[PDB]
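Researcher: I'm comparing several assemblies side by side, and this is the next one on my list. It has 866 residues spread over eleven chains. Same procedure as the others: predict the full complex and return the structure.
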Amino acid sequence: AVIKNADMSEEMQADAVDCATQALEKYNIEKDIAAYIKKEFDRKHNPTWHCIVGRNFGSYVTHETKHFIYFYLGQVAILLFK
Amino acid sequence: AVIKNADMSEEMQADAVDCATQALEKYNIEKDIAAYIKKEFDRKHNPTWHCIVGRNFGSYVTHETKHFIYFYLGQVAILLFK
Amino acid sequence: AVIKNADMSEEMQADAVDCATQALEKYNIEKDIAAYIKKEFDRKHNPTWHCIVGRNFGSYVTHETKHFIYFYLGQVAILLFK
Amino acid sequence: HEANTNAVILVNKAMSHVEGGWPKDVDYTEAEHTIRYRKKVEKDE
Amino acid sequence: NYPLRDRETFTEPPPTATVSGACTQWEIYDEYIKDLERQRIDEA
Amino acid sequence: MKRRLGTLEEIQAAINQCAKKVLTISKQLRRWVKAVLRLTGSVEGIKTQVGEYIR
Amino acid sequence: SDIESTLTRIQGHKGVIGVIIVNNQGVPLRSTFEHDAMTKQYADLVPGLADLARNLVRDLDPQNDLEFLRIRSHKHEIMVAAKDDFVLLVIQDP
Amino acid sequence: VDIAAVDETFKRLQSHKGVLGIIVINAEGIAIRTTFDNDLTVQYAALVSHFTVKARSAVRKLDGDNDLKFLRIRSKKHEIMIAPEFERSHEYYLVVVQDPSRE
Amino acid sequence: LTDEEMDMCRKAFAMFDKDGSGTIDTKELRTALSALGQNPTEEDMFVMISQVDQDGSRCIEFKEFVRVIQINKQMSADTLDAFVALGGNLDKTGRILVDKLRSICEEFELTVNVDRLVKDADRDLNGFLSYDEFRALL
Amino acid sequence: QFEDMEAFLRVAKYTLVKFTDMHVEMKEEAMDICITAVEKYPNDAEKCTQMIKDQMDKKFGAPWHVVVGKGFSYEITYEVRNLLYIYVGGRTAVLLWK
Amino acid sequence: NRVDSNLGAISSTLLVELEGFVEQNRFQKKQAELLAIRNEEVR
């Protein structure tokens, strides 16, 4: 897995990567990918997340101190945060 | 400026709003708002008060009959009471 | 039991802590938390208390000579004072 | 001994734009390394 | 003189919802063809 | 069509004289019955929708 | 009597092992199999590939669409004619 | 040198009728040789990578001992041809785009 | 939600915003009410629009048009008309009075009729029709 | 019935709002500031989002969230009356939520 | 034509059109003669 930018505890970075990869393996469309990646992590840790999946998107977003993750898998991109 | 529940005189609810809103714009954190307003509001109207400010709140508190405000202002609501 | 700040006798603090927590567990709504936390602690000691429950609020309070309590427990914020 | 605020959160702002798929921070799209990476994947028998 | 009465607090946090969508060149093309069609409908 | 496009009793009377009139035009020249039943049922439905509306 | 005659012709050539028609969401109607423990396999696996491929083709230049598709495995040639009403499958080893 | 051989294979394929394009993309969705510009390249690489791993997982799930050496999607404009060779130390799903309308 | 409701919604939106503004202004609305006979105040129509205007425009549009038709329609297909035919005047009792049918055949003045239908739609074989066998009649 | 991408780009200059829960003055100000952002920097889109949410940060709300792009997907939780999704230039699209 | 352009237009008519409903009464005069007229030719 490829990570370009993150500022958060690595012990749940492993949680993020194992949450995203089985999602990407299972479903076959990219709306339900951003559905699941929020949904299951939302029932895991916190009340609030936001998650983007696609290619060639631009964004500015206020960070969270220990919740900001920018994945990269197989020319398919994921962002999620609080 | 929206008030919801009150029984004070109209002249002092106007005094309360003109005390509170410019003080809200003056500061940026909201511990010191609820020090500054209550100290001022001691020196202006009557010798003892308590105020709370903030968001997502619940309380149960005893107001002398002619003293109660429930602001709902900038989505930072203020409640103040004798 | 995380207590940030107080100036007050300590077995009454014990009553504070347990009458906060079992009130929180018995109840399930935001307002009735501070409803019980007054009402019981009210009828036990003294006729005058004031009590606040929620998250992301704020107040200064004048120093009560011997009866002041603040909690922080399981993303629940509670204040008690005389 | 008499004032209170909740545990306040902290937030500044961060950016992200996605371009391409090189392995890691070994390689960057806005540089020359792409050429040499394709070179070391071009000559294997 | 004056007595003591008590009140409670009902705080409504602003309403929230969840929105999910997928932007792709096919979606965009179809919508513009629709926006153009209503233009002809308005014109006619 | 009259099912599609259905003080109240004046209007209901007028509707039912109109249905009588359809049959009178027929006179100058069994499903008769069932058409007439669903018509009257629909008219009563109009009346009770109104009656719940005033509540 | 043209649809069923074409079904009967197409199911009797030298390699064909099954013809399937499936609706929009599912419901494989008019299979051709002596048991139905693997029809449902086709019906819920393949139209994901058909509409995923319509995504791949159409994304490029939106005047474009998809019409057919073939997947040739080692021992099978899964040909799918996808379109708006349904998805259609014919299986054949050459 | 074999680099002349593979470039020669590009002119072997590309000398055929109607063949608009040839490109090679590895398992990490990054193109290696091209024939297009750079952005049609990267969008092919991403799209076809995801699509072909879904299709191979489909065929392997459908039957345990059967894999695919072939893939052919159709347009009304151009018949994209994907070939993969799933192996270790190499899995290079080359993809051609062609159509018999032109010339 | 359906496809012909969009047709009727477009036709009625054409009827209201009659000049072609693309937005329902108050004057065309009062024109529609005055064609229907009503000439109310210029303060109640303000409140009516302000409940229907969501965007702050003081003018309602097709999205708001179908929003109000959607809420009023689907909040409050063949169940009601066949139901309220005669048995829906009885409200889940299954016993229809013969005198109602005699009155129906009385008022519409029909030339020849024999009521053997109710004699030969009798499926409980008592002399009345429950609702399921009533649909079996229909 | 135009017959390429290019005649589509000749027609497609409008900025249709795909879905939006915003006040009309809210809508016009946000819509125009986003079109000025997209026309200002077509190449580097990161600093388009810089400009969009920092203007909305100082003026309208303390929290804001802008996403511009070419092809993507999203699922967000957003407080109501503050959501903008528009198609700009017949290709680029922008999600915007508080 | 003479026996089934009538009897597939006699069954195509619409009697009631779109208080004042007395106009309907007047309206239902007119088409009455219609069917009567058509019927005579088929007879």
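Model: For your comparison table: Chains K and B do not touch (no CB pair under 8 Å).
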